[PDB]
Subunit: 162 residues, 3 copies
């Protein structure tokens, strides 16, 4: 069906333990769905929630990439200065080829909105033919980051296939 | 009893040999005192001088992080193109979690003053609960960097903390 | 002879298999010459063509740096999202000290021209006394990249020398 399969992974001890709801996952889904056309026809086919533990985060990025063959994986949360925030360190263990331009743009554009954006420690890269991008836990943030990436994201997914 | 303990590491073969006064060290200290309130009550409680040798740099960063439990270490010097400049490589070996946002802002703002800022090779990150940031050797640089980071550095330290 | 020896490595399956010409090499050469004065008298004394293979790329970056003692290697291509593009992964295995500010500037400046600049995965750094800078595969790009760095590239090369 979908030209590009997208999966969104929410990282949060609080959500994962049933102690709270996921306010970022829906919005993330909603932004991808709303931009399907500019993304060359992409659709979120899976979401999941892990806690702030690297091995849990690694296993999913691995599975989604190697086995389910997702084309785009966004992570939400676990990428700030909190002691538990380990999303980037797990992300960095699984990508094969880094994509610093995407990080640069996310940081450049979100700084225009607030200096607290410098607290984002996001990683991004390519494993196999999957693009993986770390994004922040705030709901407003995915929208801000996806607006920033949108001009090039379709061309990026196109190039990873060839 | 300061809320956040800051420590300042001067890196310079020259200074460490006694061949000259430390110019960067004290000024740096003076900047932090000056910004104490904006930093949520941070104060320098220790300095040290080392030469341009990775092992010595690693040892003090390690000991200040692991044993003295400093909240903020700023290195000054050893982060340019000169053959002996190895501060960032030392730093990279001791941090656990990178914080590229701090490098981006320092780099974005310093470029507005001069294109020679592109020669800063600063690294930065977190080891345990210690934030570590490489800053240049010029005395005026510390202050320009501190001004650039100041809007978010209070919120950074409070997040590391708990 | 030349105050600074520059070498240009062109990375491309197509070019290396004699299935197409090098349109980037020549511009790169041309830009360096046209910029000899501002680079404190530099000159391209070698070029080569390798395919998209990490070992073939490392071998030359290693040889030019360690044996020929070049002072400035530029690479052209293999630094985007295509499956075969491994120039940056090659480059990172050989440099000893990274130079994130050259990357920050090349990205910042080229983003002003187009958002597809975010797809550049360039790396850059120093091995021995050799500056290594990745650049994109378009001919226009080397010129845009070199305009961004030229203000400081002289001081950089002078600082590596001693």
């Amino acid at each position: 069906g979908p030209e590009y399969k997208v999966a969104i992974l929410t990282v949060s001890d609080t959500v994962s333990a049933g102690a709270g709801p996921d306010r970022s996952g829906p919005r993330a889904v909603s932004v991808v769905d709303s931009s399907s056309e500019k993304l060359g026809g992409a659709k979120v086919v899976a979401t999941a929630v892990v806690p702030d533990e690297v091995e849990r985060i690694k296993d999913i990025l691995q599975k989604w990439s190697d086995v389910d063959e997702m084309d785009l994986i966004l992570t939400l949360g676990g990428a700030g200065f909190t002691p538990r925030d380990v999303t980037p360190e797990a992300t960095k263990k699984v990508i094969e080829r880094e994509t610093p331009g995407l990080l640069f743009v996310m940081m450049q554009e979100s700084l225009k909105i607030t200096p607290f954006a410098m607290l984002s420690r996001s990683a991004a890269g390519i494993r196999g033919s999957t693009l993986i991008i770390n994004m922040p836990g705030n709901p407003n943030a995915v929208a801000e980051c996806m607006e920033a990436l949108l001009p090039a994201l379709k061309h990026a997914l196109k190039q990873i296939k060839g």
